[PDB]
Structure 1
Amino acid sequence: GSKDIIDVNGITIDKNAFKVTVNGAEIELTKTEYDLLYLLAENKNHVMQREQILNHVWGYNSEVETNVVDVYIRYLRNKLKPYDRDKMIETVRGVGYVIR
């Protein structure tokens, strides 16, 4: 049972590095969800295809099934719903996903 946030010698360190700041609060993510969010945010207004998302977040050779992108888009949306940000991740039926 590792302590969530630690302060020592004036330094603040969180057990989970993968948080994002929203409305003065923090959404807590996994590495994969955080990387997906960053990738979509970095490409705002530029639709990303499921396979290029797979390549960036999971790796170009990845043996993972491509639908893991959909699985995680849904994990991400569920993380953003309590903060009324989920609708920012939209589906382009047939292509992939985009933040606008």
Structure 2
Amino acid sequence: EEVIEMQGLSLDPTSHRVMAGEEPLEMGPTEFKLLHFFMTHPERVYSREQLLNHVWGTNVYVEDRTVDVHIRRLRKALEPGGHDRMVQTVRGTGYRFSTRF
């Protein structure tokens, strides 16, 4: 597990930190986990049901639209460096994380 860097956005597990350039971005633990999954599997879409599975649990109960709300917070928080652009929606399929846009 190393520091993940893309488009000037970094996530270091060790320090447990998210930084847009030299600017650190505050955000709850769920979001950190969310981004941590996206950043580990970029250029791949996931339906909400797959996010709750990969991020919450194969046996978790949370409702599909819960995902949206977290994508949203992960976006409001990825704003300072304009990186919310990387948190991409895919109509009728789910969400994607990508360096392309």
Superposition TM-score tier, normalisation by shorter sequence: 0.7 to 0.9
Matches within 5 A, 1:36-55: 36-55=34-53
| Number of equivalent positions | 84
Q: How high is the TM-score relative to the length of structure 1?
A: 0.77
Identity %: 43
Q: Give the secondary structure class of the aligned counterpart of 1:21.
A: strand
Structure whose residues are more often strand by fraction? 1
Moved beyond 6 Å, runs of 4+: none
* Counterparts of residues 1-100 of structure 1 (less than 5 Å): 18-100=16-98
Q: TM-score, normalised by structure 2?
A: 0.76
Shift of 1:65: 1.1
d(CA) in 1 for partners of 2:70, 2:94: 13
CA-atom RMSD, angstroms?
1.3
Give the number of the structure whose alpha-carbon radius of gyration is greater: 1
For structure 2, list consecutive stretches of 5 or more residues without a partner in the other structure.
1-14
Greater helix share, structure number: 1
Unaligned runs of 5+ in 1: 1-16
